[PDB]
C-alpha cells in the first residue's frame, strides 16, 4: 500500500556519470509498470530473462535501479555478454542477467552550446571489471617502464575523459539517459509485487 518510487528514478533532474552509476534500492512496495509502458517511444527497451508483458504478475525480493548517462553509440554495450570501453571499465552486466534496460535521448537536457563537461567516463584500467563493480579512483595510469609518482606526463595519463556534449552533434554523439532494473529473487519472502 506504498507504491514504488519509479518516477523518482526516471524524472530526476540530474543523472550520474558512467563510472559512478548511482545504484538505488526499492523494496516493500506495489510496482505498477503501466507508467513505463505509457512513456514516449523509447530508443531502447529490452528485457532479459523476463518478458516485458509478464511484469505486474511477478513478485521479487528486491529491485535495484542504476542510472547513468552515456553517448549514443555506446547503448549497445549495456547488455549481457558485451565487450567495449563502457563494458570493460565502467559498467558490466552478468551473463545470466535478469532485468530490463531502458534508454532515451536527452539532448534537450544534457547539452550546452559551448559544451557540457560535467559527464566523465574511464578510458584506462589494468583489468576488466567484475559484474556490478564500481571504480571511482583517480590515480595516474602508468603505461611505461618509469613511474610518475602522481604527476601527469609522457606515458602517464589521467584515467578519465569528458564527453563535451553539444547540440549540433549527430544522434550517435548525443546524450542518452539509461536506467537498468535488476530483479532479484531469493529464499526470503517477496517484497515487491505487481497489482
Amino acid at each position, epitope marked *: 500500500t506504498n507504491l514504488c518510487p519509479f518516477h523518482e528514478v526516471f524524472n530526476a533532474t540530474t543523472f550520474a556519470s558512467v563510472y559512478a552509476w548511482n545504484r538505488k534500492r526499492i523494496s516493500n512496495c506495489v510496482a505498477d509498470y503501466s507508467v513505463i509502458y505509457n512513456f514516449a517511444p523509447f530508443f531502447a527497451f529490452k528485457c532479459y530473462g523476463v518478458s516485458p508483458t509478464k511484469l505486474n504478475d511477478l513478485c521479487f525480493t528486491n529491485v535495484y535501479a542504476d542510472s547513468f548517462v552515456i553517448r549514443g553509440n555506446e547503448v549497445s554495450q549495456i547488455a549481457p555478454g558485451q565487450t*567495449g*570501453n563502457i563494458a*570493460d571499465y565502467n559498467y558490466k552486466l552478468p551473463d545470466d542477467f535478469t532485468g530490463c534496460v531502458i534508454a532515451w535521448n536527452s539532448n534537450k537536457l544534457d547539452s550546452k552550446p559551448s559544451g557540457n563537461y560535467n559527464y566523465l567516463y574511464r578510458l584506462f*584500467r*589494468k583489468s576488466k571489471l567484475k559484474p556490478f563493480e564500481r571504480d571511482i579512483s583517480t590515480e595516474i595510469y602508468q*603505461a*611505461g*617502464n618509469k613511474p610518475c609518482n602522481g604527476v601527469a606526463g609522457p606515458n602517464c595519463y589521467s584515467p578519465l575523459q569528458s564527453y563535451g556534449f553539444r547540440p549540433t552533434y549527430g544522434v*550517435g*554523439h548525443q546524450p542518452y539517459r539509461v536506467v537498468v532494473l535488476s530483479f532479484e529473487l531469493l529464499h526470503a519472502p517477496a517484497t515487491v509485487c505487481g497489482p
Partner: antibody
Amino acid sequence: EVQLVESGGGLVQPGGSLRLSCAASEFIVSYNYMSWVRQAPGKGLEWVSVIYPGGSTFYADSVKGRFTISRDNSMNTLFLQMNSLRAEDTAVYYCARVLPINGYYLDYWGQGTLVTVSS
Amino acid sequence: DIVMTQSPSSLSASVGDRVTITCRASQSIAYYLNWYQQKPGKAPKLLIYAASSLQSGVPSRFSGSGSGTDFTLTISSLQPEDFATYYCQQSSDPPEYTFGQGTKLEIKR
C-alpha cells in the same frame, strides 16, 4: 624513445599459416591499446585488429575468423596469428599504439613487414 | 559505414606556397579526425589529432580546422621536406576506424 620492431614476414602458399611479432621498448604492450594496420601494394591503409589493455579483441570483417591477436607479458611482445591466408591478404603490416586520450589516434608506428601470399 | 573522401587526389605546388587539403565525410563525425604523413617506404607519421591539435615535434606551419562533415589541412609555408602522401582518418566509432584514399603532393615544374 618509443620503439616498435616487427618480424615474421615471409612467403606462404595460399591456405597456409604465418605468425608476426612486434617487440616494444620504453612502454609495455599489456598496458596500452595496440593495433595492426595493413597497406596493400599501391593502395591505401586498412584496419585489421585492435586489442585493449584488459584483453578485449576486435577484428575487421575481411579477416574475422581467420586472424588472431595476442601478446606475451614476459617478452613484452605482440603477435598476429594468420590462418587460411588468401591471395588478397598481401600487404605490409604495421603494429601501432593507440592513444584514446583525445579521440583515437595512432602515435607510434613500427617499420613494417611484408607478407606475400602466392602459389 | 562511414566513407571518407579526399580532394584533390593529386596536387602540385612550389616551395613557399600555401596548400589546402579537404576530407569530406558521409556522416557527422564531430571533431574526431586525424591527419597522417607517409613518405615512400616508411611508416605514416601523425601530424594533427582532434582536427586541430598539433602533435609534439611537428612544425608550426601545419594547421587544421573543421567540424561536422568538412575538414581541411593547411601548410602555411611549403618546404622541400613536405612532399608526401597525406591520409585523413576518422575515429567516430571507437573500435573501427577508416582512412581516406590519400592526397599525393608533388613539386611544381
